[PDB]
Amino acid sequence: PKSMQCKVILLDGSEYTCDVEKRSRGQVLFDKVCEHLNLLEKDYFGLTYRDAENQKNWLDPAKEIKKQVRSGAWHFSFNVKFYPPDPAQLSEDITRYYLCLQLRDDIVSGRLPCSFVTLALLGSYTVQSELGDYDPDECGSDYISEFRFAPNHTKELEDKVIELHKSHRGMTPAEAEMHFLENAKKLSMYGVDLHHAKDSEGVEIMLGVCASGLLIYRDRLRINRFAWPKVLKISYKRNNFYIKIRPGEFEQFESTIGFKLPNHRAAKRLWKVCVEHHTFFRLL
Numbered sequence: 001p002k003s004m005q006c007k008v009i010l011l012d013g014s015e016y017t018c019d020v021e022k023r024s025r026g027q028v029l030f031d032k033v034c035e036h037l038n039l040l041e042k043d044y045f046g047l048t049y050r051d052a053e054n055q056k057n058w059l060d061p062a063k064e065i066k067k068q069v070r071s072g073a074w075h076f077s078f079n080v081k082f083y084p085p086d087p088a089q090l091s092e093d094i095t096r097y098y099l100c101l102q103l104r105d106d107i108v109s110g111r112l113p114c115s116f117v118t119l120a121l122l123g124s125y126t127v128q129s130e131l132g133d134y135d136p137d138e139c140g141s142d143y144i145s146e147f148r149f150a151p152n153h154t155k156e157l158e159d160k161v162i163e164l165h166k167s168h169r170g171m172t173p174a175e176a177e178m179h180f181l182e183n184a185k186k187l188s189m190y191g192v193d194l195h196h197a198k199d200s201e202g203v204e205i206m207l208g209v210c211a212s213g214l215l216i217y218r219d220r221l222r223i224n225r226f227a228w229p230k231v232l233k234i235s236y237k238r239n240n241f242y243i244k245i246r247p248g249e250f251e252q253f254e255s256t257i258g259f260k261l262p263n264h265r266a267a268k269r270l271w272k273v274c275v276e277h278h279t280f281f282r283l284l
């Protein structure tokens with residue numbers, strides 16, 4: 001029974017290696033990675049791979065791995081798929097920990113924009129969780145942490161992390177991670193998956209997929225939101241993506257809204273993540 005080697009980049013930046021039968025469905029690998037991570041609240045997470053166009057794709061757990069990675073390497077990342085709007089509701093501290101690791105990468109990468117003060121506050125909770133109480137012996141006036149906190153580090157930011165870290169004496173790791181999450185969950189781009197698109201007129205927009213619905217950034221700023229309950233049908237055709245809106249009160253007809261995606265694969269990918277968010281957040 002022939003087995004394929006799988007390499008998974010974990011959220012701590014380390015590499016998990018395992019073997020699965022070459023006809024294995026994604027769920028098989030996901031279950032192995034989640035057992036490795038001692039993760040029981042698996043519903044929020046998934047594996048990504050890179051397609052032939054180097055685009056991130058979710059590995060569908062119901063479909064054969066070989067029919068998704070196709071001609072590419074069996075290389076994956078473990079990632080948060082559904083960002084919970086209220087992480088305090090999660091049953092396990094270890095789930096909140098993995099969510100913290102994902103968000104730290106969201107921040108350093110620039111996917112999750114953050115004010116100076118929030119970068120320093122989030123940083124100070126990470127430092128408290130991982131090193132415990134502030135110690136002056138490790139940190140002089142010229143201290144720079146090994147921890148990556150921001151897309152661009154400044155001495156000012158390092159100083160503010162330390163100033164807030166001092167305020168957190170006695171804080172336990174789960175407590176610091178919960179504080180991290182109470183701040184992160186409020187950021188305007190928390191759990192927003194962004195997709196480049198054009199509107200029905202050809203103007204460049206971003207579509208954001210998240211718990212609260214489909215967001216349109218017709219400018220650099222948000223300009224429209226469609227709450228999932230208002231969406232009856234998500235569809236794609238060629239390079240186009242469509243949402244069927246419920247009729248407003250006393251309106252005779254549903255309304256259909258159309259967007260142009262970079263290519264057919266990008267339209268299909270956007271359709272699938274919207275359907276998945278719609279289902280997940282309808283049930284949560």
Ligand SMILES: COc1ccc(C(=O)NCC(N)=O)cc1
Pocket residue numbers: 026027030043045046047058059060061081275276277279280
């Ligand atoms: C709409 O709800 C969904 C939709 C999709 C998933 C999913 O693919 N998770 C990752 C995995 N490998 O199991 C989980 C729940």
